[PDB]
Amino acid sequence: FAPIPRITWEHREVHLVQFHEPDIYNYSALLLSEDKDTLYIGAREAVFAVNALNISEKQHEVYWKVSEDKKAKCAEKGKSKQTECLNYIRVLQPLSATSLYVCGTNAFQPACDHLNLTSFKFLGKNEDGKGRCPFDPAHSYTSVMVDGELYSGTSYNFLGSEPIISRNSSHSPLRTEYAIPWLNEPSFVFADVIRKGEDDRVYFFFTEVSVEYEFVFRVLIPRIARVCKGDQGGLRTLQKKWTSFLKARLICSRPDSGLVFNVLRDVFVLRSPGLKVPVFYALFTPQLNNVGLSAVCAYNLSTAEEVFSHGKYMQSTTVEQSHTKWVRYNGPVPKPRPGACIDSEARAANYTSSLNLPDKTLQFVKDHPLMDDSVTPIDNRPRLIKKDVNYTQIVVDRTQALDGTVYDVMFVSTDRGALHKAISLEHAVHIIEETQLFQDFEPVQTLLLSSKKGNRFVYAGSNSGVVQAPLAFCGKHGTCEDCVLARDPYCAWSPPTATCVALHQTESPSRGLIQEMSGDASVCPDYRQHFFKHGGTAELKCSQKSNLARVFWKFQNGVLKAESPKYGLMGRKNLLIFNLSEGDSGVYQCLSEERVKNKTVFQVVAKHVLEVKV
């Protein structure tokens, strides 16, 4: 299990910019512009444009509030008039340079519209968002705009009994089948297009009730799925339906410890400036006995692609003679491959679209959407497993250290408004710091990263507002030792400026900078006076930031024992000399000790010169 966050930053001790509109709640949708300087917020009954560099600067505002006759219609359907019967923005996507595509629950009448960016006024397109947007603010939902066409995963109805992964195309509308083999009680988590003869694919991530597994209760299972951008459906069968829909198990577990995380919470696509293949960073929690635990598994796209392209499918079979069981299909697979895209191979066999695929192949995919092979993580284990924390959303920044060693920086939000910064150091997790983003411990519902030159920020939304944080707080570190010991690839010590700087931001010289991810503060170069009355009591204040260090006191060059009657420890860090007399005068030193590898790192926290009067 991952250790405790090395340093805890109170909302008070760091520079965090906040945004909220009075009487406006549920800041669940976040979208930043092309230029990255304008962040758009989708809340309950409102859409805003804020300066992404200072979220507190409100630029534009637009509302989409529900009428009383629509609220009462919703309430008459036994829903909560002042809770669920309101317009929760669920779809906030780029449409053009001059517009956004917006959908809201709208007292259970999913409605879509175009937000005119030049005016920040809605165009009144008033489209029926049934299938595109959920009815209930409680229902799961995911959407990705690909080539001005919305690819959405949510419920097709009011009750949330009909799930749907569909494309609102207008030219070629396509949707999933309303069948258990296709989708079995899913809870949508994330979707994105993975761009390139070879066609683009639109991946979907969700948790659904498993068909392959049987246990005491119904077992959930994380799913990775994909569809082909060029899909047009089948001609005779799969009319207006996906022909390219294949899914597989997403497995996040440490078995030598019986830890299985079968509930997917978030998915982030690490788009490597260097690496040609994207890495999905997926966030999971266990369905069973969650108390709570969180795990972060990283999946190489190539792995998943290997399953969808060459993996054996699963067959459903009748078993004695009213039951259905699912097993590996070892029978003959049709050609062209069921679920495959219109690639170079297909085009050679005179196949231009799904509309001209053989009925043999189309029937196969319709009856075999599920793959036998699981999609496994890189190094076949989670990147991080944490206890006593319920992680909510994830973002990852691939950063180059001073050394040139590349670290994948994990920003993980909690259900209590906190953000953890973690890196997988040499075969062990290091949680650099934790920051309390929300003073009200509101769970971070959404998280969004901008790693772009200048505007390097993380944006977190909750029901109470939005928070803007940098990727590091290098300046909070006082000494070179403190700067190095942090083991943050973002932070380096600058001897000329006598400040711990943010490497890859500051205008300090690279060649003349200090950073050691080993934590060996050895690479570094290197008195509060008091006058108290006789008989009186002294409180010598001492504090440090490491949650992984312990402090001890020293008087007259010896390790002082804070025991009654002469001594006491107030708050485990502040020394208390009780009965002051001639001999108590002199130097009192507060020291810290923290283990890095095998070695211990002692640091002098406080220096005190106590003088007792006569």
Ligand X SMILES: *[C@@H]1O[C@H](CO)[C@@H](O[C@@H]2O[C@H](CO)[C@@H](O)[C@H](O)[C@H]2NC(C)=O)[C@H](O)[C@H]1NC(C)=O
Ligand Y SMILES: *[C@@H]1O[C@H](CO)[C@@H](O[C@@H]2O[C@H](CO)[C@@H](O[C@@H]3O[C@H](CO)[C@@H](O)[C@H](O)[C@@H]3O)[C@H](O)[C@H]2NC(C)=O)[C@H](O)[C@H]1NC(C)=O
Piece of the chain touching ligand X by CB under 6 A; list 19-27, 111-119, 360-368, 579-587: 111-119
Nearer to a second copy by Cβ, of 119 and 290: the residue is 290
For residues 270 and 473, give the distance between their C-alpha atoms in angstroms, rounded to a whole number: 23
CA geometry: angle at 598 spanning 589 and 525, to 5°? 50
In this structure, what token pair is assigned to residue 503?
A: 């490497």
Residue 379 site contact among ligand X, ligand NAG, a second copy, none (CB < 5 to 8 Å, cut-off depends on kind) = none
Nearer to ligand X by Cβ, of 239 and 290: the residue is 290
At residue 34, the 3 state secondary structure works out as coil
Least distance from ligand NAG to the Cβ atom of residue 57, Å: 4
CB atoms within 10 A of CB 128: 11
Residue 4 near a second copy by CB under 8 A: no
Least distance from a second copy to the Cβ atom of residue 392, Å: 18
Least distance from ligand Y to the Cβ atom of residue 46, Å: 12
For residues 495 and 513, give the distance between their C-alpha atoms in angstroms, rounded to a whole number: 7
Residue 462 near ligand Y by CB under 6 A: no
Which residues have CB under 8 Å from 255's CB, separation 6+? none
Residue 213 near a second copy by CB under 8 A: yes
Residue 120 near a second copy by CB under 8 A: no
Residue 302 site contact among ligand NAG, ligand X, ligand Y, none (CB < 5 to 8 Å, cut-off depends on kind) = ligand Y
Sheet architecture: strand order including 46-51: 29-32, 38-42, 46-51, 58-63
Residue 211 near a second copy by CB under 8 A: no
Least distance from ligand Y to the Cβ atom of residue 253, Å: 18
Residue 137 near ligand Y by CB under 6 A: yes
DSSP state of 354: G
Residue 463 site contact among ligand Y, a second copy, ligand X, none (CB < 5 to 8 Å, cut-off depends on kind) = ligand Y
Residue 393 near ligand X by CB under 6 A: no
Residue 253 near a second copy by CB under 8 A: yes
Nearer to a second copy by Cβ, of 315 and 353: the residue is 315
Residue 172 near ligand X by CB under 6 A: no
For residues 140 and 133, give the distance between their C-alpha atoms in angstroms, rounded to a whole number: 10
In this structure, what token pair is assigned to residue 246?
A: 């294949």
Piece of the chain touching ligand X by CB under 6 A; list 116-124, 209-217, 271-279, 541-549: 116-124
Site string for ligand NAG, 47-66 (x = CB under 6 A): -------x-xx---------
For residues 325 and 211, give the distance between their C-alpha atoms in angstroms, rounded to a whole number: 7
What is the Cα gyration radius of the chain? 29
For residues 404 and 536, give the distance between their C-alpha atoms in angstroms, rounded to a whole number: 56
Least distance from ligand Y to the Cβ atom of residue 463, Å: 3
Q: List phi, psi (to 5°) of 547.
A: -75, -10
For residues 249 and 581, give the distance between their C-alpha atoms in angstroms, rounded to a whole number: 72
Least distance from ligand Y to the Cβ atom of residue 279, Å: 6
Least distance from a second copy to the Cβ atom of residue 582, Å: 16
Which residue shows structure tokens 């499918």? 313
Cβ atoms of 182 and 206 within 8 Å: the answer is no
For residues 91 and 497, give the distance between their C-alpha atoms in angstroms, rounded to a whole number: 47
Residue 352 near ligand Y by CB under 6 A: no
**Strand (E) or helix (H) holding 268:** strand 263-270
CB atoms within 10 A of CB 171: 7
Which whole-number Å values give the CA distances from 130 to 64, 106, 110, 165, in the listed order? Answer: 18, 11, 6, 12
Residue 101 near ligand X by CB under 6 A: yes
**Strand (E) or helix (H) holding 304:** helix 301-310
Piece of the chain touching ligand X by CB under 6 A; list 27-35, 384-392, 453-461, 497-505: 384-392
Residue 118 near ligand X by CB under 6 A: yes
Residues followed by a gap in the chain, C→N > 2.5 Å:
196, 526
Residue 116 site contact among ligand NAG, ligand X, a second copy, none (CB < 5 to 8 Å, cut-off depends on kind) = ligand X
DSSP state of 571: T
When binding is defined by CB under 8 A, the residue of 21, 149, 212, 345 that contacts a second copy is 212
Residue 378 near ligand Y by CB under 6 A: yes
Interface residues with ligand X (CB under 6 A) are: 101, 116, 118-119, 123, 149-150, 168, 170, 257, 290, 292, 388-390
Interface residues with ligand Y (CB under 6 A) are: 25-26, 44, 137, 276-277, 279, 300, 302, 378, 463
Interface residues with ligand NAG (CB under 6 A) are: 54, 56-57
